[PDB]
Amino acid sequence: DVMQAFGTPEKQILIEPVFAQWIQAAHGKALYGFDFLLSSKTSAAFANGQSLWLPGWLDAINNNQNSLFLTIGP
Amino acid sequence: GNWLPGSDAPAWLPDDLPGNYGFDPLSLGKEPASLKRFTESEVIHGRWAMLGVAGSLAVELLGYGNWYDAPLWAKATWFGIEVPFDLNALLAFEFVAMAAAEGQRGGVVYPGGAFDPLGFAKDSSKSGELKLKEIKNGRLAMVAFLGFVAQHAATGKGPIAALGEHLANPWGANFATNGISV
């Protein structure tokens, strides 16, 4: 607030939630570009269920007009 | 000879145990009830992983097989020959086989009778000298098999091929070109 008040929002302390952003990546959201588990196309976890339900899943997680694992910031 | 020079060996490991070099810092075998259990399971892990290694060396040792690429077929394939089926049939007749024979352990280290036909265990004065060698070939294998799994996840390669890669370029290709430590 004080930084906002003095007209210097660039001085804010904004910590990015790296840990949740990691989890979302492991779940297959590709925004953050960590490439883990269900993000990475060369992972056993991906190759196992890719012809099961993941196409319906991954399609839904990455539609950001829906509520499923919303985008996260400071 | 204990595992760390100087150090005093704890009260609970009598050195009349086979291969006691005084290693239980975490003091997991403090209680003798819980110790007798681990003395048993040690020997079994020891015994399996000794076959486990011996086995998954012999596979790729003389033939273009590999222990990581063995299950591919899920037609099985022993020593170049065909096979007697599939998945369900092996599971069933491995479940019952194992479940029965391990079920009937009403836990022993040296059950003998059937398991020593040729008759080595016998002559008290050397009986112990084997049980050391038992557990040390036991441990050395359990380490090696972990060594076989660790190197596989880093590379693709495969035990005897990794050994051959290291002999070509020893200084070059070793364990600081993967990621256990960066």
Binding site: G7, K11, Q12, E16, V18, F19, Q21, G33, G73, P74 | -
Partner: protein, 150 residues
């Protein structure tokens, strides 16, 4: 880059946040002569504010779609953001705490200790103050020795 967020050295929004703030102060500075007092302040602030933006671009922080610098708090691109400072605190806080410990114990054995919490023995405290410089080396040795816990 990390979490897909851009670096402040490159990002457009961040560089347009530069412009807006500066061009707020240059709309003020018009209403004063150049020789005047407040003109030297609205120039000096600008110089400082324009220097500030430059010094995060050189620092290389990650700026988002917002235009604001976000921070990284785990591992090594962005150590100095949190990982170094973090120790800074645990030191100086540990410093304060252990000095305070050595004071209360040093008083404890002296008939009425409660007087020394109020009329503080300054020349006791100012000796413990400096002693409390090497505190983690003492704090460890005290955890070892086994005088640390009741």
């Amino acid at each position: 880059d990390i979490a897909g967020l851009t670096p402040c050295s490159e990002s457009k929004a961040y560089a347009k946040l530069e412009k807006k703030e500066l061009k707020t102060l240059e709309k003020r500075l018009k209403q004063y002569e150049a020789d005047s007092a407040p003109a030297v302040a609205l120039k000096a602030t600008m110089e400082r504010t324009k220097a500030r933006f430059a010094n995060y671009a050189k620092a290389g922080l990650l700026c988002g779609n917002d235009g604001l610098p976000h921070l990284i708090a785990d591992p090594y691109g962005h150590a100095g953001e949190v990982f170094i400072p973090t120790f800074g605190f645990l030191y100086v806080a540990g410093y304060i705490g252990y000095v305070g410990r050595q004071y209360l114990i040093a008083v404890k054995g002296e008939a009425k200790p409660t007087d020394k919490e109020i009329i503080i023995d300054v020349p006791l405290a100012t000796k413990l103050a400096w002693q409390g410089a090497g505190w983690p080396l003492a704090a460890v040795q005290e955890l070892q020795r086994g005088t640390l816990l009741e």
